[PDB]
Design a protein around this nucleic acid. Sequence first.
DNA 1: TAATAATAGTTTTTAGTTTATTGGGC
DNA 2: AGCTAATAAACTAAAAACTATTATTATG
Lengths: 507, 232
Amino acid sequence: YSGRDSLIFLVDASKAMFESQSEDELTPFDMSIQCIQSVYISKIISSDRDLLAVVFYGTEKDKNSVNFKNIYVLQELDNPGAKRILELDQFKGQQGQKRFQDMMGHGSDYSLSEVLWVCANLFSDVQFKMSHKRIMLFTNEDNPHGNDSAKASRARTKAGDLRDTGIFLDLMHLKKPGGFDISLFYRDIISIAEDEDLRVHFEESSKLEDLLRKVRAKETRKRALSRLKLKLNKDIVISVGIYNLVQKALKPPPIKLYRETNEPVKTKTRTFNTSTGGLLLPSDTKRSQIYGSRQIILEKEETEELKRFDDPGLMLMGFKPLVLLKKHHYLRPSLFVYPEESLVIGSSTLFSALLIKCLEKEVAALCRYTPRRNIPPYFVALVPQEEELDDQKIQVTPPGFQLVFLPFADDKRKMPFTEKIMATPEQVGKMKAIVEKLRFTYRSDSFENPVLQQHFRNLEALALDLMEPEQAVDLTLPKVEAMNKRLGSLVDEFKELVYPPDYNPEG
Amino acid sequence: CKIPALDLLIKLLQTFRSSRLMDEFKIGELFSKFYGELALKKKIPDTVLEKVYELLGLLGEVHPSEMINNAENLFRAFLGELKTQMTSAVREPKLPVLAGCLKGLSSLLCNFTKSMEEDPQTSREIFNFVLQIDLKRYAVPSAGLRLFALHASQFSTCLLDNYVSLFEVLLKWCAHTNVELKKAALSALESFLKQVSNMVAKNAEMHKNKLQYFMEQFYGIINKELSIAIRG
DNA sequence: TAATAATAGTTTTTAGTTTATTGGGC
DNA sequence: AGCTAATAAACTAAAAACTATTATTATG
């Protein structure tokens, strides 16, 4: 865990945010609010347990507790909800903006120091462990608070103060026809870990394209599967963390709730004497398995100890070259092992030495693995995956041992096999050409389950109670027309090459 | 079901310990519903919530016959639970709150039934006799000692065994720290000695236990332990 | 006289049960 | 022209991890 995330959005309640160079372009307030909607939807599906708030500045009215003028808070730091989405969308649009300007003011003098006070106080309100005091704001101009030198000085003083307090903030470039005026008033006063300010950005060219994009995932935090241990012989033991860099996600379980109250009704379940109508007890339980006629009775710890073979841990078997593993031999999704000094101190040194040595030897680690108590231990192989970096020196692959599992004899399922049949080499060349026609470079993040996407689409659609639900796009459908036009007549050429001209492959 | 349930349960328990037989006679249905909710096959309540066992310890009513009928169900449940717990082979000897709570339950329940006329008597004998080492100020041993002290009588004709082991374990228990454990062990001492004397005095083999149990330790005594020796 | 140390309270996977399930039959 | 079996999916309980706190003893 080690902290949580929270963002607060700041919108200039002025008239510059309520115009457009051309009607094809929305107002700054318009694309800001729609990007806010997209961000909130993403947070709900991704990390709904975070904190989000909305505050406005420059408006005529105000709502902050300290009651600084022009400082109207809209929403406080809370887990996002569809109600907030509705509150935002009631003013999102070419007329909802007018509704907002009617029921709410816009355009007045203020001090950025005041909004910084308000946001700092809002930070003070939250109490859970917190890690990312990210602040987001939206405008296309900087100099209005540089107009008053005293206002500029106090604003930059408070900005330095909040930077000292660990607060991090980010601004979106908005389309100002005369240029946002980078480097004039903000990047010297705002918090940046890097400098790319080169163009005063007459347009809104910054990272809205990423933010408006909707993501659909869960992004489970880095949680150690176990600090399980490797028993070398009987006493040489090291502490290593267990991880799964891939973990099959699935649709969240439903919650059974009422009809007219919609309340999730608790469901107590028990067992009673059917022959009597009385009541039975968990102690009054006996499991049976009848093979033919004889009935055999087993109990709780009776069924437990049959699963008992050894203590949960890793028991080294030996070493074998990596090549001696058949690729088609697969059991289930692989695991990953990372060292740790939390329990066994110096175990990281041993892990590094083993990784380097076995990488030199090109050998695999054979070991007996017991996940937890009362489980049959299974043999596994630890292939050393070296940490690989990129042009950005980011870990495209972390260091450690990828944990692949070794199937047993029962796993092997033989099938009715046939003889070996060969093919003419010219047909093989035709296949090579046809493959080259439709070849491409695979990338892992280029594909996704459309079924869960459609599930989400429906979920937020009924949440947003529109006329129609959003339609997900299947990225797993082949481009049949594109592939066919890309191949040409080679398809039918090989069809007559191999398949009989009179007999189609269809029966 | 959390600290709310914990505090409410202790409140009502001490209420019965205070309010004793004035109007608290609308509890038979309450007792039945508590027994039923125990039969919830999902043991999701925490061990701390298992002081519901002390709930079944009930004396504020006349203890109607229906409570007697359900008492056998209760006892069987406790026996199954305890035999499940004490099996350290399954590496689940964890009954920290369970043991003392079922102890108090048996304490306030045995006042009506379970005379020394059946096998379950020696069963629960063996169950308690197992009193592997403990920690955390040793609450469960004190609970067991208090239970035995209150109901040493029911263990007749089968408590004479293990007499040396019982005596030495009681000695060390009253010699250990946590003076509350000391006095609980002392009470167990007096109850045990009283019961063994009563059963020996009308025995026929009394000389065997006599010369094999008592004068040697008594002489070897010669601290508050001296008072126990004199009583012995 | 008063600080520290095992402890449960949330998720989180995960590993058994349950079910409605297209094919042949003749 | 009548007949039904593996089965992934769903549904459970169950077990661990990972925080978050505290019944205990020196000790005056």
